[PDB]
User: What shape does this take?
Amino acid sequence: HFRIVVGLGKSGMSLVRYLARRGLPFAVVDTRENPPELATLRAQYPQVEVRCGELDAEFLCSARELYVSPGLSLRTPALVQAAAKGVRISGDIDLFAREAKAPIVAITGSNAKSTVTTLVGEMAVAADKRVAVGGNLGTPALDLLADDIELYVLELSSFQLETCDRLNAEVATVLNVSGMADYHLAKHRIFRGARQVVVNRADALTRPLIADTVPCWSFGLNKPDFKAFGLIEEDGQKWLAFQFDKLLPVGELKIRGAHNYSNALAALALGHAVGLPFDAMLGALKAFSGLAHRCQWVRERQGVSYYDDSKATNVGAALAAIEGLGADIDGKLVLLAGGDGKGADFHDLREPVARFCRAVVLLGRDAGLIAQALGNAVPLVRVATLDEAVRQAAELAREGDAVLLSPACASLDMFKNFEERGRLFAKAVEELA
Assistant: This one.
């Protein structure tokens, strides 16, 4: 029967391409008045009606089925009236789930899902599989469909799972949970029809009831047991481990901190469940420097490692990296910070800096402001350029320390965006003698 695309974004346009190539009659609605895709849609799909305006329950009831974009609230009045008359409320992921003829790795959770999703993708690439990665913010799932594909890796948001009826994922995981009942019930739908699950030993709420009847792999930071990825501590070294077997000393990883070890172990668990070899996975794990500008490893020079965390444009993001990297390393931190502070209260940085920093290097407009908030009990130096800051940190860092650009400020006083700031930080580091 008839179908309607409800919402015209990146996912909506993928629904336009999918329904058109399959030869199915459909129409499109959007609450805007000159949406961007309107010029392309009038030129490339001239036979499709595009109804721009406030949603009308009357118009939607001419469809037996609707595909709602993740942004829109499922409690929008027109959508509630349409489901009462019997319209099936669906979405791109629900169509993808019915059309896939290859296993699906399905990942949902907090912001941490980007590292795990990216890792499993690079692991599968290292294993010579034809793999498509998408979902959530990323390539729309329906665009990934192809008959040569051997493995789908999907980062799914709570909204995308709300309109999904039965995903039939080969392995599925909710990375972490800990009110907010609706958020976690939606995420939990990722387990509908799942043939394997990966659970977090640190968070009992990520374990679905089906873990008692389907293969259940776990990850965590303590010592692993049957079907578990964990940490073994033998001699003075911590090792990533599977069951009784030591896989790799964490010191050979480029990423740092407890959260990254857990993300690495979850990615090992997910990749294992789909038969990725350990040798391929561990090599990819060793080569992964991190996400662009999220505490990203740049270089090791004379036993000092340099980390680009330029995305930390606020106090909260920088405190997380100061405590995350500081608790993990053997030495101490040399922090580079400063820029546009947005009037933030920098007081929250004093104690972690006193506990983890050997010195602080300050640049940017609000460098004097951060200085007064840190006090006169940590060694401070104020510089004018990023290259001065990098060389000044290298003159302060002793072996085993970490040089951390976690500015806690925006970069627009001296740079184009934070990404150019991190890119130029890496350049100054790569140019040290």
